[PDB]
Structures are given as C-alpha cells and as structure tokens.
Amino acid sequence: MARMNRPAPVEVSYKHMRFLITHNPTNATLSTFIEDLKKYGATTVVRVCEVTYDKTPLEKDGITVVDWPFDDGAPPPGKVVEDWLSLVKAKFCEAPGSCVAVHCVAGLGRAPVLVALALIESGMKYEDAIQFIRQKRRGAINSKQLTYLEKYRPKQRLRFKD
Structure with a gap:
C-alpha cells in the first residue's frame, strides 16, 4: 500500500469550481499523491481531517498547502x-x-x-445535504x-458579496 498507481482520484466539477478527492492515507503514498494532483491541475491542496506531514518540497514546486487540523493553534x-x-x-x-x-x-x-x-452555501438545507453526501455510506x-x-x-456567501 505505497507504490500503488492503478486507482485514480475523483474530480468533482460543481457550478462553483472543481475539487479532486483521493482515498487511502498519505506519507508512504504521498510521493505519488503530489504527482497525481499536479497532473489533474490541483495546484492547491487542502487538509481538514488530520495533518500528518510537513509542507516543503511540494510547496516550493508551486502548490498552496492548507494544513488546518495541526494543533490547538x-x-x-x-x-x-x-x-x-x-x-x-x-x-x-x-x-x-x-x-x-x-x-x-x-x-x-x-x-x-x-x-x-458548499452544498448548503449554494442554497440547500444541511438535513437534505446529508442524503446527498452521506450516499457514499455513513461518514456524515x-x-x-x-x-x-x-x-x-446559509446567506451572505455564494449569492452576492464579491
């Protein structure tokens, strides 16, 4: 579970933008994860669940890394x-x-x-949005x-601001 290159990520093209989503962990696979996102044009990487690596080689190659769940900071x-x-x-x-x-x-x-x-901020109610995202089976x-x-x-964002 490291040299694995056969399974690809999934590109979600919304009315707002396009986001790539990749299963499996990082570190051991990270050496291919970066090479995948930069092929799909995902020159921004965003991590919200838990962060497990330090952004240097991939950042200095031109990628915006966003590391939210790093500490109590x-x-x-x-x-x-x-x-x-x-x-x-x-x-x-x-x-x-x-x-x-x-x-x-x-x-x-x-x-x-x-x-x-983004599903709610486009105009949905989160109670409906569960049945949309949770369809992958649990996790929401x-x-x-x-x-x-x-x-x-759900107002003041994806309506009229910018």
Missing part, C-alpha cells in the same frame, strides 16, 4: 466555515478555473463535511459537524 470546525467559502471562492478566482485536491485520514467516510459546506452523521447551520447562516 487552529480553531474548531465551527469557525473554519468562513475560511472554507473564502478558500473555495479564491482557489477558483486566482485562475480561470483550476482544481483543488483534498485528503483525509481513511477510516469512516471521506471528510464530506468539506464538500457539503456527527454532532457539531451537522448542527453547524443552527449557528451558521
């Missing part, structure tokens, strides 16, 4: 929402489309808490993960 997944919309907005503003690759610690789901965020049924809307407004 980062905020909880409650405020990271505004950072989310402003990111996915800007990573598609900086170029005439581009791509963004996203990764998580393989176990139960594929960090759908990321993509689902935590507490503060989904109850987030009960504090975060």
Whole structure:
C-alpha cells in the first residue's frame, strides 16, 4: 500500500469550481499523491481531517498547502466555515478555473463535511445535504459537524458579496 498507481482520484466539477478527492492515507503514498494532483491541475491542496506531514518540497514546486487540523493553534470546525467559502471562492478566482485536491485520514467516510459546506452555501438545507453526501455510506452523521447551520447562516456567501 505505497507504490500503488492503478486507482485514480475523483474530480468533482460543481457550478462553483472543481475539487479532486483521493482515498487511502498519505506519507508512504504521498510521493505519488503530489504527482497525481499536479497532473489533474490541483495546484492547491487542502487538509481538514488530520495533518500528518510537513509542507516543503511540494510547496516550493508551486502548490498552496492548507494544513488546518495541526494543533490547538487552529480553531474548531465551527469557525473554519468562513475560511472554507473564502478558500473555495479564491482557489477558483486566482485562475480561470483550476482544481483543488483534498485528503483525509481513511477510516469512516471521506471528510464530506468539506464538500457539503458548499452544498448548503449554494442554497440547500444541511438535513437534505446529508442524503446527498452521506450516499457514499455513513461518514456524515456527527454532532457539531451537522448542527453547524443552527449557528451558521446559509446567506451572505455564494449569492452576492464579491
């Protein structure tokens, strides 16, 4: 589970942008993960579940690495929402489309808490959005993960601001 090059990532092209999604872990496979995203045009990499490596060789090759869950020096997944919309907005503003690759610690789901965020901010209700993202089978049924809307407004983002 390291030299594996046969299974490819999945490119999700929304009305807003395009995001690449890759199963399996990193470190042992990272030496191919980077070479995959830069082929798909994912010159931005964004990590939200847990980070396990240090961004240097791949960053200095031209890639924007975003390492959220690194320590208590980062905020909880409650405020990271505004950072989310402003990111996915800007990573598609900086170029005439581009791509963004996203990764998580393989176990139960594929960090759908990321993509689902844009699903609500486009105009959906998170209770409907579960049945859209969770369709992969579990991985989108935590507490503060989904109850987030009960504090975060689906207006003032992907409507009229920029």
